[PDB]
Amino acid sequence: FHEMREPRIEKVVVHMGIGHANAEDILGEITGQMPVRTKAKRTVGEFDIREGDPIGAKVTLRDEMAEEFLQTALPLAELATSQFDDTGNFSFGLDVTVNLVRPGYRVAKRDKASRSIPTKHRLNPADAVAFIESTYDVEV
RNA sequence: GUUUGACUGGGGCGGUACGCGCUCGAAAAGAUAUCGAGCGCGCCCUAUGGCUAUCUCAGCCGGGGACCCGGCGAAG
Numbered sequence: 001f002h003e004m005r006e007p008r009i010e011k012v013v014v015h016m017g018i019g020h021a022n023a024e025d026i027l028g029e030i031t032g033q034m035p036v037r038t039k040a041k042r043t044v045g046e047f048d049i050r051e052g053d054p055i056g057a058k059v060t061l062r063d064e065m066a067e068e069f070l071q072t073a074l075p076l077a078e079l080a081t082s083q084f085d086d087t088g089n090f091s092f093g094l095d096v097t098v099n100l101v102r103p104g105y106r107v108a109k110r111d112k113a114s115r116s117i118p119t120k121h122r123l124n125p126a127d128a129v130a131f132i133e134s135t136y137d138v139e140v
Numbered sequence: 141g142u143u144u145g146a147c148u149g150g151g152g153c154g155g156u157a158c159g160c161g162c163u164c165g166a167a168a169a170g171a172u173a174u175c176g177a178g179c180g181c182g183c184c185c186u187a188u189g190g191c192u193a194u195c196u197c198a199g200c201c202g203g204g205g206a207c208c209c210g211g212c213g214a215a216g
């Protein structure tokens with residue numbers, strides 16, 4: 001029961017919301033894999049009337065890539081209870097987002113007979129702080 | 141030598157109900173008038189057409205009015 005309930009890392013998304021790019025090179029270094037451009041929507045007074053066009057970049061890491069990143073990334077932040085989602089997610093900072101979830105998450109990400117994850121199987125902030133804190137760092 | 145139209149609560153002036161589309165008037169099939177009420181069309185587009193692949197939108201909340209992550213969300 002506990003084995004298929006103990007949290008894990010779905011993905012670690014690192015992104016730099018600039019607003020017009022040349023910053024891909026560092027992400028390609030700090031994470032290890034190719035980043036992708038970020039386009040915006042809706043015209044914007046702040047000389048941002050171009051809908052589709054480079055404005056940011058991000059890198060989504062999974063498995064090892066994700067953990068090998070957090071090992072050297074988490075120590076760079078000072079996690080706090082507020083910094084946590086209602087789903088058991090937390091992001092710090094160049095933004096760094098950590099998406100945590102339980103084993104059979106796929107049930108909501110697959111194509112056939114997908115289904116939404118029952119709140120009971122949904123990760124909790126409490127369960128989140130724990131799991132994480134239970135590995136190289138402090139809380140509040 | 142001719143023409144100078146029609147409609148119209150008389151005619152003139154005003155207007156066009158003079159060709160078209162929608163809601164209501166219209167009375168739960170269809171049809172249905174007034175110078176009836178609300179209001180549009182005489183285009184624009186080589187993509188703003190076609191198919192395929194991948195995908196889900198408004199709006200609100202939570203975490204780092206531009207961007208990133210998650211949640212709610214049959215359609216506003």
Ligand SMILES: [Mg+2]
Nearest residue numbers: 141142143144
């Ligand atoms: Mg004669």
Ligand SMILES: [Mg+2]
Nearest residue numbers: 146147148151
């Ligand atoms: Mg007459």
Ligand SMILES: [Mg+2]
Nearest residue numbers: 166168169170
């Ligand atoms: Mg009828």
Ligand code: NA
Nearest residue numbers: 037038053054
């Ligand atoms: Na781009």
Ligand code: NA
Nearest residue numbers: 143144145146
């Ligand atoms: Na005539």
Ligand code: NA
Nearest residue numbers: 153154155175
């Ligand atoms: Na009159």
Ligand SMILES: [Sr+2]
Nearest residue numbers: 141142143144
């Ligand atoms: Sr005459």
Ligand SMILES: [Sr+2]
Nearest residue numbers: 149150151152
């Ligand atoms: Sr009279």
